[PDB]
């Protein structure tokens, strides 16, 4: 019950960060097109 | 119906059928149309009350909403009454009721959104009277036993949560937030809650850490603090109280922010004290630092029983186990005092007896004169060292080390780490002191500075005992000008006598040689001394040391290596509470350079530890600003630039790993999934991030003290034998070490083969061997692991080592840092009062992996042992008490603590 | 240079400006042969008011009363054209990207504590 309400909390940051991140972090603008 | 001749009192049986409707016109039609009728309104109103528990009694949703058709309309100023200031009000008590029924239980949305303003006000003006008291007092207890009164009394409560929450959601807080439109704080709404909560501790266990937790307040521990100290006994016995106490801290306190996140460790340390069960409270009492509530507690435990007994012992072991040792000479001298026996008590306070249990384990586990490593290179460098690693703990080698041949055999800088080494197959022990002391007079001042930080090493097992002080060896050596033999020695003293706090440690490090006057690198190591001391207990964020550091790192910053040892270790002294590095964390932004910004992230990192709101989301708006630079123009000086970038990657892990020890265990498996993904966007994103991130990676799977320990640590592993770095395997197999032979049975047979293999450097090759070797130990021979004690997400002391080296660049200096793991971890003994080594039986549950355990409650199934076994991380941990058979009742209550048993045998 | 505009007829007179029409229609014709495209330059005729002070030839720096308003003939522009546009444009990219995977956290949290 609360335990479950504990976890709840915290996935929900977690998606959210991550979500954030990851556009800049794929690229977006970093576009790697150098030599190799 | 809403018919004006079903007002009476006559047709309240022929309604009832269908749904008693006879107070539908009663409230509504008139109230309106005569004044004189809210008078008759009165008499009539006992009538109306018994309504509404005839229809509680058949809880079905026809029934309200048949029942109601204008009852929702008429309140008191819909009907535009108020007359005789007394008749409306006394009219509020049966219409309450009524709105919460079609809100909820027949389901309707957009009754919940609007009906939720009226509802709490209608509670608030009537609760000043304290009439409303009277109207929830009356299901809450019920006296009359139905559906309803179940369902009911959640709905008022439903609302309380909501009033304390408009707090928390917006500045305007009370009234001018009209999700519910009623204060927070009043005259009439505080006279509510506690009359509420505690009716409610009795008849749930989930209700009242809600109110808690969205009020973000410490107003709400205060008005339960006092309720708390009501019922702990009377309502329900001493023992389940106390387990009500510990679920409902752990919910609330991770959200809320530092001033106040520590309020809430205040209130339930008070409450733990109070109860007759102190073996939780002496935890809290590690977690603040603060030496005044380790003396009230101590004497709490001690005062009870004017005679050894079970008293005394419980007290002295309690202490024993945070081998921080700040704790055990705060708990001398109240024992001493008494004069028992004086010895035995300092003995088991202090650390002595620790050295002791383990003499006896050794035997079982077999006592080995095994080596591994290979001639030749910088592996005959390597085997030496090696021996060191794998005899973990106190063991038996001396026949080995007795050769002087091999000790002279190795090159270089190596025979400073041969002769530390030696230290570690005596680690957590005196005897074995004799070996060394020839090497410190003798050759080479390589050996000399060898000799003296194994001497640290060795003498870990005391800092209480007081048995051959590590001062007596120690000081001559800061005395000798020579840098090496000075900095081995006075890096000894903060080891030995590791977290405890005495005169001799104190004015030994008065003078510090960290200055620019020797520009040498192992200056440095004057203040990362003075890190170990102030560590496990709260800091005075001393200004010496920032004064140094700054006076060294702008004069010199063409080594940036100087400056990051200085750096890192401020950052390590500050660790165990964030709220006055805060305060100085403004001393170092005030002057500002890139070499300070390196600072910045890191002493931050301590500093806004207390909430995950801030701490969480600062590293990771650092952690972009890198990419984007980049990013843009693909669309000294040196020195400078190389330190940001690897800091911030540092700080991002070192962030996340506060985090989940601080907070609850649902962080844990939490931030670790965070972390696996991330990964790939720090792969994806730079070529340098790739590389840093492993090294970091590894510590963050050790540092974190990570639940899962079977899919992940293998993954990463596999994939980083291709990839740059073989750093990633030293720092990765210290938490693979942790269960050892499991993890690490993995760990030897993959790295340790095919690193030999497709050897291509004896360096990188040196890398892989030693972890491989050093994260096996032989047959279940002592483990290292971060736990302190009670805590096993402690404030680690000798054990950032790891974290001091991982960040810089690999060196031949590193290796004889490297030898330092000290952090044993102890057996799990029943003991009463005669101290009689082993275990009866325990259990233990080593299928842990659940991320749903955050509570501190073990899972209760186990699988019984009956051999003394040390506690394995996350494997091991759930620690129940089995001794029913002759009959026993626990004095020290196991929580998965690592602490060894004590019960009352009948 | 943003100086010439392109004359139909002579407004005085009412009556065909001749060199401005044989332009129009050679320019139009241009799928058969390509650099019939520059007798469009032809049609542009210059539009300023010149002063000429006595019969010297010599333009006078003098000024004129002009009752309009200002904006209407404000002096066109200096264009960004395209590569003023690429400059502008992959600034804007860099920092749009940056702006949301920042302010999404950061506004939840900011109020909260």
Redesign the interface.
């Given at each position: 019950?609360?335990?479950?309400?504990?976890?709840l909390?915290?996935?929900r940051?977690?998606d959210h960060?991550?979500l954030e991140?990851?556009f800049?972090?794929?690229?977006?603008?970093?576009?790697?097109?150098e030599k190799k | 119906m809403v018919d004006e001749s079903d007002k009476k009192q006559q047709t309240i049986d022929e309604q009832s059928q269908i749904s008693p409707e006879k107070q539908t016109p009663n409230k509504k039609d008139k109230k309106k149309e005569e004044e004189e009728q809210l008078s008759e309104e009165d008499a009539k109103l006992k009538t109306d009350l018994e309504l509404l528990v005839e229809r509680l009694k058949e809880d079905d949703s026809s029934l309200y909403e048949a029942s109601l058709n204008a009852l929702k309309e008429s309140i008191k100023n819909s009907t535009s009454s108020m007359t005789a200031v007394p008749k409306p009000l006394k009219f509020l008590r049966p219409t309450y009721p009524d709105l919460c029924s079609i809100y909820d239980k027949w389901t309707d949305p957009n009754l919940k959104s609007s009906l939720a303003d009226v509802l709490s006000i209608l509670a608030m003006t009537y609760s000043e009277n304290g009439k409303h008291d009277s109207l929830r007092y009356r299901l809450l207890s019920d006296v009359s036993d139905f559906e309803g009164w179940g369902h009911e009394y959640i709905r008022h409560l439903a609302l309380e949560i909501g009033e304390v929450y408009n707090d928390?959601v917006e500045?305007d807080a009370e009234d001018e937030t009209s999700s519910d439109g009623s204060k927070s704080d009043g005259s009439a709404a505080t006279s509510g809650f506690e009359f509420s909560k505690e009716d409610t501790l009795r008849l749930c266990?989930?209700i009242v850490?809600y109110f808690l937790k969205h009020n973000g307040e410490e107003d709400a521990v205060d008005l339960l603090l006092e309720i708390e100290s009501i019922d702990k006994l009377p309502q329900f016995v001493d023992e389940n109280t106390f387990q009500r106490v510990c679920?409902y801290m752990v919910?609330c306190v991770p959200?809320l922010?530092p001033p106040e996140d520590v309020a809430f460790l205040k209130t339930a340390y008070s409450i733990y004290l109070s109860q007759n069960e102190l073996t939780d409270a002496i935890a809290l009492a590690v977690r603040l630092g603060e030496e005044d509530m380790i003396r009230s507690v101590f004497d709490a435990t001690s005062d009870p029983v004017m005679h050894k007994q079970l008293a005394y012992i419980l007290a002295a072991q309690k202490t024993s186990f945070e081998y921080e040792g700040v704790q055990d000479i705060i708990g001398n001298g109240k024992l001493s005092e008494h004069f028992l026996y004086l010895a035995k008590e300092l003995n088991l306070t202090g650390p002595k007896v620790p050295e002791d249990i383990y003499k006896s384990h050794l035997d079982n586990s077999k006592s080995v004169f095994s080596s591994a490593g290979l001639d030749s290179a910088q592996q005959n460098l390597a085997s030496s060292f090696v021996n060191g690693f794998l005899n973990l703990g106190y063991c038996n080698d001396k026949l080995i080390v007795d050769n002087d041949n091999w000790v002279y055999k190795t090159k270089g800088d190596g025979m400073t780490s041969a002769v530390a080494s030696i230290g570690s197959i005596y680690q957590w022990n005196l005897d074995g002191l004799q070996q060394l002391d020839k090497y410190l007079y003798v050759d080479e001042p390589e050996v000399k500075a060898g000799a003296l930080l194994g001497i640290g090493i060795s003498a870990s097992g005391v800092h209480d005992g007081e048995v051959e002080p590590a001062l007596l060896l120690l000081q001559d050596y800061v005395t000798n000008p020579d840098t090496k033999i000075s900095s081995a020695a006075i890096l000894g003293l903060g080891i030995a006598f590791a977290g405890s706090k005495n005169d001799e440690v104190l004015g030994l490090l008065l003078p510090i040689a960290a200055s620019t006057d020797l520009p040498i690198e192992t200056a440095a190591m004057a203040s990362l001394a003075l890190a170990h001391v102030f560590v496990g207990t709260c800091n005075g964020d001393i200004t010496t040391s920032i004064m140094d550091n700054f006076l060294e790192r702008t004069a010199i910053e063409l080594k940036t290596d100087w400056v990051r040892f200085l750096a890192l270790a401020l950052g390590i002294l500050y660790m165990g509470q964030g709220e006055q590095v805060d305060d100085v964390l403004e001393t170092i932004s005030a002057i500002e350079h890139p070499m300070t910004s390196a600072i910045e992230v890191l002493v931050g990192s301590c500093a806004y530890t207390g909430?995950?709101?801030?701490l969480?989301?600062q590293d990771?708006?650092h952690?972009?600003t890198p990419?984007?630079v980049?990013?843009?123009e693909?669309?000294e000086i040196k020195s400078e630039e190389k330190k940001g970038k690897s800091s911030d990657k540092d700080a991002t892990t070192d962030g996340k790993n506060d985090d989940e020890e601080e907070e609850?265990e649902?962080?844990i498996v939490?931030?670790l999934?965070?972390a696996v993904?991330?990964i790939a966007?720090?792969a994806?994103?730079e070529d340098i991030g790739k590389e840093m991130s492993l090294r970091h990676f590894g510590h963050l799977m050790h540092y974190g003290n990570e639940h899962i320990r079977r899919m992940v640590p293998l993954a990463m592993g596999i994939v980083s034998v291709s990839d740059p770095q073989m750093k990633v395997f030293d720092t990765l197999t210290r938490f693979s070490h942790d269960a050892d032979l499991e993890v690490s049975m993995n760990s030897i047979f993959a790295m340790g083969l095919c690193g030999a293999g497709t050897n291509n450097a004896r360096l990188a090759q040196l890398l892989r061997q030693l972890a491989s070797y050093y994260s096996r130990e032989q047959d279940a021979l002592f483990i290292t692991r971060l736990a302190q004690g009670l805590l096993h997400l402690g404030k680690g002391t000798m054990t950032m080592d790891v974290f001091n080296d991982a960040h810089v660049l690999n060196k031949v200096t590193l290796a004889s840092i490297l030898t330092t793991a000290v952090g044993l971890v102890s057996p799990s003994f029943m003991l009463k009062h005669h101290q009689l080594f082993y275990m009866l039986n325990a259990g233990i549950r080593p299928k842990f992996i659940l991320?749903?355990?955050?509570?501190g409650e073990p899972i209760k199934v186990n699988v019984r042992v009956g051999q003394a076994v040390e506690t394995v991380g996350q494997a091991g941990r759930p620690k129940k008490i089995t001794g029913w058979i002759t009959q026993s009742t626990p004095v020290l209550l196991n929580h998965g603590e690592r602490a060894e048993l004590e019960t009352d045998e009948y | 240079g943003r100086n010439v505009t392109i004359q139909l007829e002579n407004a005085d007179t009412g009556t065909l400006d001749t060199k401005s029409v044989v332009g129009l229609v050679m320019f139009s014709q241009f799928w058969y042969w390509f650099p019939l495209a520059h007798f469009l330059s032809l049609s542009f005729t210059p539009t300023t008011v010149i002063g000429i002070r006595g019969s010297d030839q010599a333009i006078p720096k003098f000024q004129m009363n002009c009752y309009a308003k200002e904006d209407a003939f404000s002096y066109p522009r200096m264009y960004e054209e395209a590569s003023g546009k690429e400059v502008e444009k992959?600034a804007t990219?860099?920092l749009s990207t940056?702006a949301r995977?920042?302010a999404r956290?950061?506004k939840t949290?900011k109020?909260?504590?």
């Open positions: 019950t609360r335990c479950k309400l504990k976890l909390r915290m996935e940051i977690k960060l991550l991140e990851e800049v972090s794929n690229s977006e603008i970093l576009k790697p097109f | 928390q500045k266990l989930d850490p679920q919910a959200l922010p909430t995950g709101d801030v969480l989301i990771l708006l952690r972009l990419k984007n980049k990013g843009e693909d669309a609850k649902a962080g939490d931030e999934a965070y993904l991330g966007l720090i994806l994103g991320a749903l355990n955050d509570e | 992959v990219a860099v940056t995977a920042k956290a950061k949290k109020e909260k504590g």
